[PDB]
Amino acid sequence: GEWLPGLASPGYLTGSLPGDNGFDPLGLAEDPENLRWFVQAELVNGRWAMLGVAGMLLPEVFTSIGIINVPKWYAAGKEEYFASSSTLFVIEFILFHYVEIRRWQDIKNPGSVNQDPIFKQYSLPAGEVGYPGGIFNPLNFAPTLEAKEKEIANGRLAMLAFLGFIIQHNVTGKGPFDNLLQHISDPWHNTIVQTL
Amino acid sequence: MRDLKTYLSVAPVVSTLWFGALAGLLIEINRFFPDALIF
Amino acid sequence: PDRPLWFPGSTPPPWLDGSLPGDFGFDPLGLGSDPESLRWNVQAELVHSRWAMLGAAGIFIPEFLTKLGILNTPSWYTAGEQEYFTDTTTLFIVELVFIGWAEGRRWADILNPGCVNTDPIFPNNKLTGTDVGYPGGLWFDPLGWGSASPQKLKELRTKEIKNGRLAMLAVMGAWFQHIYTGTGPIDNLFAHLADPGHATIFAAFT
Amino acid sequence: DISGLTPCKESKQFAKREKQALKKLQASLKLYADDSAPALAIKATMEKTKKRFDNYGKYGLLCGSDGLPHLIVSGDQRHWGEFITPGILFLYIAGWIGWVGRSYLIAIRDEKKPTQKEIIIDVPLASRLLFRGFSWPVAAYRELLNGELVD
Ligand SMILES: CC(/C=C/C=C(C)/C=C/[C@@]12O[C@]1(C)C[C@@H](O)CC2(C)C)=C\C=C\C=C(C)\C=C\C=C(C)\C=C\[C@@]12O[C@]1(C)C[C@@H](O)CC2(C)C
Ligand SMILES: CC(/C=C/C=C(C)/C=C/[C@@]12O[C@]1(C)C[C@@H](O)CC2(C)C)=C\C=C\C=C(C)\C=C\C=C(C)\C=C\[C@@]12O[C@]1(C)C[C@@H](O)CC2(C)C
Ligand SMILES: CCCCCCCS[C@@H]1O[C@H](CO)[C@@H](O)[C@H](O)[C@H]1O
Prior knowledge:
The structure is cut from a larger assembly and holds chains A, B, C and D. Chain A is mainly alpha-helical. Chain A contains five helices and no strands. In chain A, α1 (32-64) packs across α3. Chain A starts with 31 loop residues before the first helix and ends with a helix. Chain C has one domain. Chain C is 51% helix and 0% strand. Chain C is built from six helices and no strands. Chain C is globular. The relative contact order of chain C is 0.11. Chain D has one domain: Photosystem I, reaction centre, subunit PsaF (Helicase, Ruva Protein, domain 3, Orthogonal Bundle), CATH 1.10.8.110. Helix content of chain D is 58%, strand content 4%. Chain D has helices at 12-29, 37-58, 84-107, 116-119, 123-130, 136-146, and strands spanning 6-7, 62-63, 69-70. In chain D, β2 (62-63) and β3 (69-70) form a beta hairpin. In chain D, α1 (12-29) runs antiparallel to α2 and α3 packs across α5. The N and C termini of chain D lie far apart (50 Å). Classes of the chains: A mainly alpha, B mainly alpha, C mainly alpha, D mainly alpha. The interface between A and D is small, with 8 and 8 residues. Residues 27-29, 31, 48, 51-52, 54-55, 58-59, 76, 79-80, 168-169, 171-172 of chain C line the site of one ligand XAT. The PDB classes it as photosynthesis. Keywords: photosynthesis, photosystem i, plant LHCI-PSI supercomplex. The entry is titled "Crystal structure of plant photosystem I-LHCI super-complex at 2.8 angstrom resolution".
């Protein structure tokens, strides 16, 4: 992979990683452990970005075609729920504390965390760090290199898409799909140029 | 020519150009966003 | 080694052999004394030449037809300050991304001769240019005139570079003239043809 | 309000200062032809002035009994722009500079004559290390945890 043909890929990016297109011009992953931590971080930020972006765009599209009246993502938190946002935050914080500390221990030591602390009978098969599998993969799909680099690709696209959503909402004041529609309406008179 | 470039890379010349560029930048910024006391 | 010079009776600089198209031993400031600098300056002179030829044609051909009943296009000097179907800034952004792509691949070519000869989408199509500054291929040389004997290449590239110099000087001339006189270049040409004795640059400065 | 101060948009002395300033400018403006350059200059000063006062009022600044903006740096969330934010920006830029300089000094430390590249700057090297500063918190944070920051 060549992100900039033909710029020589850094020595520490030997293509032994999925998504290796030789893109690290600032040399952040010059250190091996740094490269590991950043691989994990790219996977995580990427997956959460995919989920988040999906949850931002998809409900709005279905609202446009009148399937279900769903409030936009930036106006969804405002006082509509049963348990209130504070309680929700405490719950979230607790469960995420447990889960993320767990995964963290997996990153610090791969084989250290794999079995259920309560029901020690059940366990997760020794796999790759960042790719747990086992119960996390009930449909038993093969973790091929292609599938991994596809995951990372859609992840990067979704991250950029999230930045796009944030900035676009910050400027226009409408939803991303709304902006897309207005762009379809008159492309040469509805861009970042006119909105600013 | 290489010697001239080397001279242009000497400390005082580099400093004049660098601080000249900075002065220009800060000036233009303070012309477009003047009287800034916040941010 | 044996060639006509810009300054008869002078010795050409060591770095100017004469193996380069347009070599007349002119570099009195030694701005091309270093090989890499000379090479980069060659590419820069190429793109300058071609852009200035396109430009010179672009201001002199329409202005000459505008003076006749053929066209009615406005002055080249004020063709930018007008409005179009979209704002000029949008056009400028599209220009920046497109020309940015082209100049990007060309830059990669200058810094690494081979790396940008193949089409990233369809690996079937390639460029047949041997030396940089001359891409060739089907897109940039459909008539195949780009590949020939070193003599013909020398001649053609010399013609290219010379018409380029003349064009650069011509565009600069157009700019300065429209600044001074305040009318089109054709108007100036006809005024000078009408009275070369007085209707010159001193017809306004003195 | 905070510290017994009064908001600039509600401060009388703030407004009186704007008044006296504009009136001084106009009192100077009376002597020049309206189309002349001095007139346009003084008028530019007037517009800039009132725009300044209006902007300060809009920014939510608190004024003292003097009629001047006083700053709140306690960490108060209604005034993060009065120290916290520009502080963060500063720290970012300063860290950038220092980290880049550090990179440059380390890069030439292992050479025949290091002092040379300290009196005659290696501009290609400097340009290569220039943008590395953009990610200085990330780069330094990792070097901190790694043990490549100190000896
Ligand atoms: C995780 C993420 C977003 C997650 C979003 C979520 C959970 C959204 C949740 C919600 O919407 C829903 C679901 C429903 C709403 O009701 C509620 C909210 C809460 C609003 C984005 C990451 C976003 C992350 C991004 C954009 C990262 C970009 C980084 C880049 C481009 C760095 C590039 C480089 O570092 C390299 C690669 C190499 C170096 O050498 C060179 C440089 C250039 C420095
Ligand atoms: C003059 C010029 C350069 C002159 C440089 C010279 C003599 C340097 C000479 C030396 O260095 C050497 C050789 C060797 C050294 O030892 C000695 C010196 C002496 C130091 C370049 C002009 C170069 C000029 C160029 C490239 C101009 C291109 C113009 C274009 C594209 C115009 C487009 C338009 O006009 C149209 C087409 C239609 C309009 O409506 C719209 C617009 C857009 C305005
Ligand atoms: C934006 C960077 C442009 C390239 C910098 C041009 C001068 S590069 C210059 O070259 C000299 C040798 O000739 C060296 O002695 C000197 O250290 C070096 O900085």
